[PDB]
Amino acid sequence: GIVGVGIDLVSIPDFAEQVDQPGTVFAETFTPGERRDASDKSSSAARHLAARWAAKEAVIKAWSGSRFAQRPVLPEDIHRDIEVVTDMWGRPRVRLTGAIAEYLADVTIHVSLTHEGDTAAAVAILEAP
């Protein structure tokens, strides 16, 4: 049964404006080079990266909306234990580490991402067999 659902829309312009700032959570998900390239509103990098961020936030949203919210704890490591990459063709892939990988070890994560104009989007659905 479904155990969590998330959706997230990202402004590509607003994304590129803050994606490259130090200490932010962007630094723990994208490489400096990636953040540098994504700083260009009009680049493909910004578009693709914006879409990866939406994916990640969507999963995070699904997590916070599940039974794994209320614990355990440390809402700083979940933002860091979650990662989303794209494989050649353009399909999103969710990569887990830290505690979240353990707690969602038996949970299937379904994610999809898109982007158009000044916005990127994604949806995530947590499902247990």
Give buried/exposed letters for 106-127 (b at 16+ CB in 10 A, else e): ebebebebebeeebbbbbbbbe
Q: Which of 8, 32, 19 is nearest to 119 (CA)?
A: 8
Q: Is 114 helix (H, G, I), strand (E, B) or coil?
A: strand
Q: What experiment produced this structure?
A: X-ray
Q: Which of 48, 70, 49 is nearest to 4 (CA)?
A: 70
37 is in an annotated binding site: no
Residues with Cβ within 8 Å of 34's Cβ and at least 6 positions away in sequence, in order, are 45, 49
97 is in an annotated binding site: no
CB atoms within 10 A of CB 80: 14
Residues with Cβ within 8 Å of 57's Cβ and at least 6 positions away in sequence, in order, are 6, 8, 10, 122
Q: For residue 105, what are its two tokens?
A: 């070890």
Strand 119-127 to 108-116 pairing: antiparallel
Count of domains forming the chain: 1
Domain extent for 7: 1-129
Residue 122: give its domain's CATH number.
3.90.470.20
Residues with Cβ within 8 Å of 18's Cβ and at least 6 positions away in sequence, in order, are 24, 26
User: How far apart, in Å, are the Cα atoms of 81 and each of 36, 46, 92, 94, 120?
Assistant: 23, 23, 17, 11, 22
Cα 92 from Cα 101, distance rounded (Å): 17
- Whose tokens are 């995530």? That residue is 124
24 is in an annotated binding site: no
Q: How many residues does the chain have?
A: 129
114 is in an annotated binding site: yes
